[PDB]
């Protein structure tokens, strides 16, 4: 049991006291503009505040406490060094004179240079706030590209594989595009024949992750690129799985026109229980003029925010980007260097393949298993549902991998251990997965048992949703 | 240097176990031509050296602490207690809470965030957060258009220009149309709303800091069957009548003013509050109270058909990663201050802003622009170019005179003040301004 | 179960890497000085280090998570503000040019003045590392004073009440003195009659806390002072219970000659699992010349470390004192001011006096219950053991108060809530203590049950102690 | 401002419950004359203003990051990962772990620290921590005198003068005798040890940074029936042969060199390591592994008869509060680097110190004093007053030349180098010294 911050409140109780002499409201703002009924915010002292949130953190797990093999998330260690690095630029105002923010602008420029170098793009925007935001940015760019060529009325559809993440097709809609989903081949890679059938003057772009969401590298990627080029279709790169190939291969050399990266995934920026993140977008020179404004350029006086871009799609969010996260990523790269990043990708791949071997030894299956990259997708043996095994893992002190995704594999167990997890950790995880199969169906169906809370009534929460403490409306 | 645990002996064993000859061999199945890319990155450095470099860059900047710059972000006190709590590893390194049994911490905290935001805006419900204020506005408007089925939008020019720019991008992307209502005397005149208009948007306080009269805008919107969307600074809601009380259907804003570090523009977070009756169109994550098999209180993500994993193409938004950690920081701030504490901070910044305004009026050639009543920000007309003034000010060690784009008028500059500003800081700024002028 | 850091270890595994080009030992150090066998330090990667310690912290409780009514410890809230305050002075070297450390020296001076103002002392050293260290400093000061007046051979005994903390008599021994205990009267206060028969030219000092360790103010303190002064006996004030009177009464006006304060108790410096702390020692002018060196003074030039004190007892610890803790105490006092400190003392007393009433109504006894100050001493009803109630409390999610101290009360329950705890918390606590009296005897004796570990085998740890992981020797 | 939660209504009720008419009425039984003391303290300030004042004070100081000052404290890298971990509320705000069932975090962490210190020292056991190096030494010698039953002590002048002063205060307090062995050629000559001597004390590296030959000292002590106490910098133990290997009976030192912020002198921690055979005489807390009622592994404080609570006047020491948190920071550092990482750090500092030694020797008038081989510190003979040089060096933005008391010689100054010092730092310093000279 744990109380709500609102239940801890006591009428009239004060917490922080930030004002010595509080002015009288009516001396500052006109009566009819004044709030009559105070918001029902909690009224607690600082000690209570600390115990509350510290108590909540203790009813929570994270990479700092548990192995998180979540495919499509790259739950790698978030170095504490980066938190210290970020506090160093906390006191900077986005509208302060640029000549006094050179350190910050320089960092933004360098980061952009490193990311382009690792991705093979010619220009880049560090403005978008997350991966999906980068997707919306890239697609809008691709759209502005076609429109600037008189095909804005014909290029109406976006193509995504049946294994694509939900945000890909969702983005198409936000960009006003129609979306068609192409099926995967028997190996789990792109079906060229089905692709060649869809390609045409009506397709604006093809969204892909490489490796794909099955953890497999698209071996015919160059061919796929060639087909797209002749049809005039823009090839979009979802960088969710960039961790698998950092420093070994670049999407740009694969033929991708536009790219988005997830700093809060591949580059150690902390997940923060949902966010915030950063979704930089890199593009080839022919799509560069459509980039959202402003761009960080290196000039004579120094670095500056460039707004003089006539074909720009405009603004995708306020200011210039989640700077403090950019600091985290800059720190990571300047720490590992090229060799460091390559080693990280190789071991990220080795941990995934090695663990794939352990789970198969335990009886788990892998429908699509060519040389697995940074992640892989397994299925439990007939008779076991992923949902239950996941809960069983929770009971055993482990955290389940991603479940029921990609959508093309029943009882999908999408596993991504990342390079920061140790050998013995992968083995302990595999052991736990093997043990759960030797547990009775009823035990699995009623797990967890020891967690702060057991399975929740998902039904009641959807039929009678109580969305706030006051449940107004 | 690196964070990999693997020892050489472990890599050999793992290599042999997966049938690989070396690390390089793990990538042998990739097209020969894309391998060995010519990547140029600076040599790896030990952590103390990375910090030395960070500090050198930081040493190049002039800290904005106690700055008088405004336009959306201000130098407010960042309470260490809040930052200490948000630094807890559990909150910092957790992922989106999909396994609720082990995520009650973040789940309950988000539910509390929702409650606080809904209360602050005077509305009924709120999502788990948005990237920022601008994007929150865009999503709030898209919601209104989906709810009304219309494509027309009226936005006051009083809405931060960047917000209006972001809104336009999202709007034109889906075929919707936007009409900008220009300011007259610093405020936005009541427009006539047609039935093609699905949303009416107004910010309060507005970009120039002027308090707008929302009531009639809400009545004007409803009369035409249009939804009213209010853009409001959260800290200001601590003392100003919230949009909910004006009849607003949707309220959005950026959370930076809730004790968040300025951070040169990010990250912070956006909030979106609305009526429970529009929950089906609400984008983003939502936490609901519930119970476990033993009858214990629990919290979980709900109504997920509105999101991308389940609805994919028909999702209300593509938003996956949101801005949870910073939204929690806002919640901790709101909780740490309480209703009276928040009101105290808001009134204090308003007071100092007014004192500054009064002081600046004595500077030769300076003329007022933003009309009374204004909140904690205001625009003045300067006898010299605003960018030139900001620069000269920075040369004397001050951060002030944030340039207002010409669409509002010539030579305009914004000035803000907060609870951490004192009389002496105001005078010091004025003298600096008199020297530059 | 939870692994030892040594068990997480893996041969050859590396963690932090702070050296780019590590030199070969043979080139800097001669062969015969080089360590042959490496210390068996753990070999863990950073992620492992973080999980280990994050895990250990989750198997721990503190004021940040739990109500800690420990008598004699003043477990009050430790403001997070102070941690940020100490960070501002992390990079200062004790031997850097004093002309470049004026900010730190000024702070030391100011803190000294504030502490002398609250205690009524004339001069003060901020050097001692803890309360017990302050006692030694203060007792040596008294000895230097007696020896300087030619009574060093005759002043050989230190007097302490039967209710004194064990460090008091222990300190007398470290200082070469004999120690004699004087019993308390029927009210829990000093027995003036027993005191008069002990006072004489052979007594060097009388060590007292006020309020005493029963939480009772020594109402005859002025008479005690008069009696002491008449015999030439120095009165030493153990500041463990200063929180009960700060801003309301000063030991210096009570007749005390020397005082020691505990910054980590009364002034919010964190207890850190046992340490470190700070034990400032203040004295009346007649004892000032014997103060340990150096003292912070402000001269014509500026603030400086004064070492010119010919009668000083010398040095009691390295450098000048636990500066970083001093920053925290300075912050505390500059935040609250006199009225804030007075309020804290009053509410600390009110909390104790209130909780006392609640506990008596639940059936607990208070053998000495005159007007209770910042703490009080209770005992369970006949038949119950404090130890068992203590463990029962643990099982209930609370932390017990101090048990079995002072030594003059059987089954002692020494309770000190401090001013930062709320009324509802005091009540929930009493409600818990009450419910434990209704639990069956066998239940309490075998408590706790849900804690990370149940009752430990003390006898085993004492008969067969395993002091290190390697258990060498 | 304050941290009190009580509302006026709660105080009102509580006041009635305890039978008091007001807050002041709670002190009515105190003598009337000591009440209402006129205490002079500055007016209260809000947290942001307090921080502002701390900032103004900090701005007055020239930070010592990367200083070349030595003499016990040095500017080493303070790893953020360690500081972040030592910042967890549970470690920060816990008290001495007397209720073991809920204190396994601190109890185990402390057990691991005892283990690491014992290992580093090449010995068998160590207590929970001492206040600091100087204090650890005093206690260490007192331990040896109790064990041998003697009253004589021989201490090398090579031992930090401050440690010797503290040692003297403690020793004279109990009637013990102390004889000082003067340094010859920067090293302490092997003394003749009488049977009245219970402890022979030597530091390695010594105050002047010179490496000392510990073997013959341990033998000279043992041959007379005395114990050998070694004072050693923990970081140095990562590469240098441990006193335990030389046959030392007791080892002590200050833990600042293990990544602890210099903090202008405190706090840090001191360590005391010795043989399991002398445990009965060991002062301070001691954690032992044990088991619980069901056989689960656990940790608890033990052999408490050595401490003040139980033994009072006959306790081994009056020590209650120790230096637990900082010692734990020390353990974290040790675990974070491991044996090799620690060895590398010690080596890099030794390397840079030697490189610096050679460079400064070129400055005209600068002559050597500390003989080879020295560690990461060394003393030089300068052509100008050391203090004057430090001041002059400081006016040029350099922290260096820590004055050596005349008891060691005239115009001597110590310099130190650490793992965060690079080639360019050494050169810039030399140039500066060249200038002041
Ligand atoms: C393949 C792939 N692409 C994009 C994203 C989204 O990036 P963010 O907007 O989250 O930064 C993801 C993440 N998917 O997780 C969705 C969820 O259900 O949590 C992805 O895997
Ligand atoms: C009355 C009293 N006097 C002294 C001390 C010691 O001060 P520090 O050296 O701890 O700062 C105390 C603390 N007693 O705790 C005893 C224990 O065993 O924890 C005190 O209460």
Rg (CA), chain D: 25
Q: Which residues contact C131 (CB under 8 A, 6 or more apart)?
A: C167, C238, C239, C240, C260, C261, C262, C265, C277, C279, D320, D321
CATH code, domain with C69: 3.90.1150.10
Residues C55/D109, Cβ–Cβ less than 8 Å? no
Q: Which residues contact D382 (CB under 8 A, 6 or more apart)?
A: D365, D366, D389, D401, D411, D412, D413, D437
Q: What is the dihedral of CA B294, B299, B303, B304, to 10 degrees?
A: -100
The backbone torsions φ and ψ at residue B193, rounded to the nearest 5 degrees and listed phi first, read -105, 120
- Residue among B233, B306, B324, B267 at smallest CA distance from B132: B267
Binding site membership of B288 for ligand 1 (Cβ less than 6 Å)? no
Return the residue in C172, C174, C213, C252 with the most chain D beta carbons within 10 A, the one to mutate for interface testing: C174
Q: What residues in D contact C264, CB-CB < 8 Å?
A: 321
> How far is Cα D437 from Cα D432, in angstroms, rounded to an integer?
9
> How far is Cα D288 from Cα D107, in angstroms, rounded to an integer?
9
Final residue in a domain of this structure, among C343, C361, C393: C343
Give the tokens for residue A222.
Answer: 């160059």
Domains of chain B from N-terminus onward: 58-78+341-437 (3.90.1150.10), 79-340 (3.40.640.10)
C366 and C403 both lie in a single domain: yes
SS (H, E, C) B11-51: HHHHHHHCCCCCCHHHHCCCCHHHCCCCCCCCCCCCHHHHH
> How far is Cα D130 from Cα D326, in angstroms, rounded to an integer?
10
Q: Which residue of C has its CA nearest to B85?
A: C80
SS3 label, residue B273: strand
Q: What is the β-pairing status of strands D227-231 and D197-203?
A: parallel
Q: Which residue of D has its CA nearest to B48?
A: D77
C312 and C427 both lie in a single domain: no
Residues C91/D398, Cβ–Cβ less than 8 Å? no
Give the tokens for residue C215.
Answer: 């939480």
C353 and C400 both lie in a single domain: yes
Binding site membership of B36 for ligand 1 (Cβ less than 6 Å)? no
C296 and C417 both lie in a single domain: no
β-sheet bridge partners, residue C461 = none
Residues D345/D421, Cβ–Cβ less than 8 Å? no
SS (H, E, C) chain C: CCCCHHHHCCCCCCCCCCCCCCCCHHHCCCHHHECCCCCCCCCCCHHHHHHHHHHHHCCECCCCCCCCCECCCCCCCCCHHHHHHHHCCCCCCCCCCHHHCHHHHHHHHHHHHHHHHHHCCCEEECCCCCHHHHHHHHHHHHHHHHHHCCCCCCCCEEEEECCCCCHHHHHHHHCCCEEEEECECCCCCECHHHHHCCCCCCEEEEEECCCCCCCCCCCCHHHHHHHHHHHCCEEEEEHHHHHHCCCCCCHHHHCCCEEECCCCCCCCCCCCCCCCCCCCEEECHHHHHHCCCCEEEECCCCEEEECCCCCCCCCCCCCCCCHHHHHHHHHHHHHHHHHHHHHHHHHHHHHHHHHHHHHHHCCCECCCCCCCCCCEEEECCCCCCHHHHHHHHHHCCCCCCEECCCCCCCCCEEECCCCCCCHHHHHHHHHHHHHHHHCCHHHHHCCCCCCCCCCECHHHHHHCCECCCCCCC
Over the range B385-418, which residues count as b (16 or more CB within 10 Å of their CB) and which as e?
Answer: ebeebbbbbbeeebbbbbbbeeebeebbbbbbbb
Q: What is the β-pairing status of strands D197-203 and B270-274?
A: unpaired
Q: What residues in A contact D85, CB-CB < 8 Å?
A: 80
C421 and C468 both lie in a single domain: no
Residues A6/A42, Cβ–Cβ less than 8 Å? yes
Instruction: Say yes or no: C56 contacts chain A, CB-CB below 8 A.
Output: no
Indicate if the alpha-carbon torsion angle B382, B388, B390, B392 is positive or negative.
negative
- Residue among A424, A265, A416, A266 at smallest CA distance from A344: A266
Cα–Cα distances in angstroms (integers) from residue C217 to residues A238, B392, D23, D27, in the given order:
72, 64, 16, 9
> How far is Cα C243 from Cα C264, in angstroms, rounded to an integer?
12
C332 and C408 both lie in a single domain: no
> How far is Cα D286 from Cα D302, in angstroms, rounded to an integer?
6
C217 and C358 both lie in a single domain: no
CATH code, domain with C461: 6.20.440.10
Residues C67/C421, Cβ–Cβ less than 8 Å? yes
Q: Which residue of B has its CA nearest to C84?
A: B80
Helix D324-360, helix D423-436: angle, nearest 10: 60
Chain centroid to Cα A253, Å, comes to: 23
Q: Distance between terminal CA atoms of chain B?
A: 52
CB proximity under 8 Å: A 42-81 to D: 44-48, 50, 54, 79-81
Final residue in a domain of this structure, among A322, A343, A364: A343
Final residue in a domain of this structure, among A312, A343, A374: A343
Residues C59/D104, Cβ–Cβ less than 8 Å? yes
> How far is Cα D324 from Cα C277, in angstroms, rounded to an integer?
9
Q: How many domains does chain A have?
A: 3
β-sheet bridge partners, residue C376 = C415
Give the tokens for residue B220.
Answer: 């004007």
Chain centroid to Cα D243, Å, comes to: 18
C234 and C382 both lie in a single domain: no
> How far is Cα D134 from Cα D166, in angstroms, rounded to an integer?
6
- Pick from A74, A213, A262 the residue to mutate for probing ligand 1's pocket: most ligand atoms within 8 Å of its CB: A262
C103 and C234 both lie in a single domain: yes
Q: How far is D377 from chain B (nearest CA, A)?
A: 21
β-sheet bridge partners, residue C402 = C414
Cis peptide bond prior to C151, omega within 30° of 0: no
C85 and C198 both lie in a single domain: yes
- Residue among A87, C260, A348 at smallest CA distance from B23: A348
Q: Which string of DSSP letters, residue by residue, matches D151-205?
A: -EEEEETTS-HHHHHHHHHHHHHTT-EEEEE--BTTBPPPPP--TTEEEEEEESS
> How far is Cα B48 from Cα C17, in angstroms, rounded to an integer?
10
Give the tokens for residue B25.
Answer: 């061999």
SS3 label, residue A435: helix
Residues A210/A161, Cβ–Cβ less than 8 Å? no
β-sheet with B270-274: strand ranges across: B125-126, B270-274, B250-254, B227-231, B197-203, B152-156, B177-181
> How far is Cα C134 from Cα C174, in angstroms, rounded to an integer?
12
The backbone torsions φ and ψ at residue C119, rounded to the nearest 5 degrees and listed phi first, read -105, -20
The backbone torsions φ and ψ at residue D414, rounded to the nearest 5 degrees and listed phi first, read -95, 145
Starting from the CA of residue B308, give the closest ligand: 1
- Residue among B337, C435, C425 at smallest CA distance from D10: C425
Residue numbers followed by a gap, chain B, C–N over 2.5 Å: none
C270 and C352 both lie in a single domain: no
Q: What residues in D contact A80, CB-CB < 8 Å?
A: 80-81, 83-85
Q: What is the β-pairing status of strands C402-403 and D297-301?
A: unpaired
> How far is Cα D157 from Cα C127, in angstroms, rounded to an integer?
24
Residues B117/B148, Cβ–Cβ less than 8 Å? no
- Residue among D106, D418, D391, D375 at smallest CA distance from D262: D418
In chain B, count of helices (H) and strands (E)? Answer: 13, 13
- List the determination method: X-ray
Q: Which domain holds residue C70?
A: 61-75+344-456
C337 and C386 both lie in a single domain: no
Report DSSP state, residue D408.
G
Give the tokens for residue B240.
Answer: 């100003």
SS3 label, residue D75: coil
Residues C41/D334, Cβ–Cβ less than 8 Å? yes
Query: How many residues would you count in chain D?
Result: 437
CATH code, domain with C201: 3.40.640.10
A45–C64 C-beta distance less than 8 A: no
The backbone torsions φ and ψ at residue C376, rounded to the nearest 5 degrees and listed phi first, read -155, 165
Q: How far is B420 from chain D (nearest CA, A)?
A: 7
Residues D300/D100, Cβ–Cβ less than 8 Å? yes
Give the tokens for residue C275.
Answer: 């340490």
- Residue among A312, A284, A277 at smallest CA distance from A137: A312
> How far is Cα A161 from Cα A307, in angstroms, rounded to an integer?
36
SS3 label, residue D274: strand
Q: Which residues contact C51 (CB under 8 A, 6 or more apart)?
A: A64, A65, A66
Query: How many residues would you count in chain A?
Result: 473
Indicate if the alpha-carbon torsion angle D272, D276, D281, D283 is positive or negative.
positive
B92–A270 C-beta distance less than 8 A: yes
> How far is Cα A251 from Cα A246, in angstroms, rounded to an integer?
10
> How far is Cα B218 from Cα B202, in angstroms, rounded to an integer?
10
Ligand 2 center–CA B16 separation, angstroms = 60
Instruction: Say yes or no: A17 contacts chain D, CB-CB below 8 A.
Output: yes
Q: Which residues contact C151 (CB under 8 A, 6 or more apart)?
A: C201, C232
């Amino acid at each position: 049991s744990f109380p709500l911050i609102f239940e801890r409140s006591r009428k009239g109780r004060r917490g922080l006291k930030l004002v010595k002499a509080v002015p009288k409201a009516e001396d500052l703002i006109p009566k009819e503009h004044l709030r009559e009924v105070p918001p029902r915010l909690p009224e607690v002292d600082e000690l209570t505040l600390v115990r509350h949130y510290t108590g909540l953190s203790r009813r929570q797990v994270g990479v700092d406490t548990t192995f998180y093999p979540l495919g499509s998330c790259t739950m790698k260690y978030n170095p504490k060094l980066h938190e210290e690095a970020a506090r160093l630029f906390a006191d900077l105002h986005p509208y302060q004179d640029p000549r006094t923010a050179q350190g910050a602008l320089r960092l933004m420029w360098e980061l952009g240079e490193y990311l382009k170098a690792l991705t093979g793009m010619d220009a880049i925007t560090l403005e978008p706030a997350a991966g999906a935001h980068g997707e919306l940015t890239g697609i809008l760019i691709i759209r502005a590209y076609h429109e600037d060529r008189g095909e804005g009325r014909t290029r109406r559809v976006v193509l995504v594989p049946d294994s694509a993440h939900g945000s890909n097709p969702a983005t198409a809609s936000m960009a006003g595009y129609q979306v068609r989903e192409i099926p995967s081949g028997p190996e789990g890679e792109v079906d060229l024949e089905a692709l060649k059938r869809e390609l045409g003057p009506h397709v604006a772009a093809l969204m892909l992750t490489n490796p794909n969401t099955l953890g497999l590298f698209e071996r015919r990627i160059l061919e796929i690129s060639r087909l797209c080029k002749e049809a005039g279709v823009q090839l979009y790169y979802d960088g969710a799985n960039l961790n698998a190939i950092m420093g070994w291969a670049r999407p740009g050399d694969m033929g991708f026109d536009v790219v988005h990266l997830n700093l809060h995934k591949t580059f150690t920026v902390p997940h923060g229980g949902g966010g915030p993140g950063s979704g930089p977008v890199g593009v080839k020179a022919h799509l560069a003029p459509y980039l959202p404004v402003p761009l960080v350029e290196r000039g004579e006086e120094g670095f500056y925010l460039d707004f003089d871009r006539p074909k720009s799609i405009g603004r995708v969010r306020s200011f210039y980007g989640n700077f403090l996260a950019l600091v985290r990523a800059w720190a990571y790269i300047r720490t590992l260097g090229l060799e460091g990043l390559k080693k990280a990708a190789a071991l990220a791949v080795l941990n995934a393949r090695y663990l794939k071997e352990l789970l198969k030894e335990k009886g788990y299956r892998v429908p699509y298993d060519g040389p697995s990259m940074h992640e892989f997708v397994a299925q439990p043996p007939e008779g076991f549902r992923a949902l239950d095994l996941a809960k069983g893992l929770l009971e055993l002190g482990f955290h389940p991998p991603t479940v029921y995704f990609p959508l093309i594999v029943k009882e999908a167990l999408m596993v991504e251990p990342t390079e920061t997890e140790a050998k013995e950790t992968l083995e302990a995880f595999a052991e736990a997965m093997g043990a759960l199969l030797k547990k009775p169906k009823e035990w699995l169906e009623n797990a967890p048992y020891s967690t702060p809370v057991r399975r929740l009534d998902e039904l009641r929460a959807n039929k009678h949703p109580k969305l706030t403490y006051f449940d107004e409306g | 240097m690196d964070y990999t645990p693997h020892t050489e002996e472990e890599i050999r064993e793992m290599l042999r176990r997966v049938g690989a000859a070396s690390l390089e061999d793990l990538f042998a199945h990739l097209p020969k031509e894309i391998l060995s890319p010519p990547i140029d990155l600076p040599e790896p450095l030990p952590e103390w050296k990375v910090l030395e470099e960070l500090r050198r860059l930081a040493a190049q900047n002039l800290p904005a602490h106690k700055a008088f710059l405004g336009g959306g972000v201000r130098s407010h006190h960042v309470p260490p207690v809040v930052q200490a709590l948000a630094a807890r590893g559990e909150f910092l390194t957790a992922y989106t809470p999909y396994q609720p049994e082990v995520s009650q911490g973040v789940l309950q905290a988000t539910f509390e965030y929702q409650t606080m935001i809904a209360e602050l805006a005077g509305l009924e419900i709120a999502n788990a957060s948005m990237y920022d204020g601008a994007t929150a506005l865009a999503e709030g408007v898209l919601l209104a258009l989906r709810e009304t089925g219309r494509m027309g939008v009226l936005v006051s020019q009083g809405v931060h220009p960047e917000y209006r720019a972001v809104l336009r991008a999202y709007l034109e992307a889906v075929g919707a149309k936007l009409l900008t209502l220009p300011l007259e005397g610093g405020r936005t005149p009541l427009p006539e709303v047609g039935e093609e208009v699905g949303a009416v948007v107004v910010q309060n306080p507005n970009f120039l800091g002027a308090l707008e009269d929302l009531g009639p805008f809400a009545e004007a919107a409803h009369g035409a069957g249009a939804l009213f969307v209010a853009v409001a600074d959260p800290l200001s809601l601590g003392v100003l009548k919230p949009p909910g009380a004006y009849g607003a259907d949707i309220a959005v804003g950026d959370g930076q003013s809730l004790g968040l570090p300025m951070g040169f523009g990010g990250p912070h977070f956006g909030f979106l509050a609305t009526k429970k009756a529009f929950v089906r169109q609400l984008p983003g994550r939502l936490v609901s109270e519930t119970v476990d098999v033993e009858g214990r209180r629990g919290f979980i993500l709900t109504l997920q058909a509105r999101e991308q994993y389940i609805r994919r193409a028909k999702a209300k938004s593509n938003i996956t990663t949101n801005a949870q950690l910073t939204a929690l920081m806002g919640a901790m701030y709101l909780a740490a201050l309480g209703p009276e504490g928040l009101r105290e901070v808001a009134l204090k910044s308003v007071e100092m802003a007014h004192k500054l305004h009064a002081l600046l009026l004595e500077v030769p050639g300076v003329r007022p622009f933003t009309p009374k009543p204004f909140f904690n920000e205001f625009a003045l007309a300067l006898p010299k170019d605003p960018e030139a003034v900001r620069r000269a000010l920075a040369e004397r060690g001050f951060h002030g005179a944030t340039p207002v784009p010409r669409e509002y008028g010539e030579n305009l500059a914004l000035f803000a003040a907060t609870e951490l500003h004192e009389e002496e800081d105001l005078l010091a700024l004025r003298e600096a301004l008199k020297e530059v002028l």
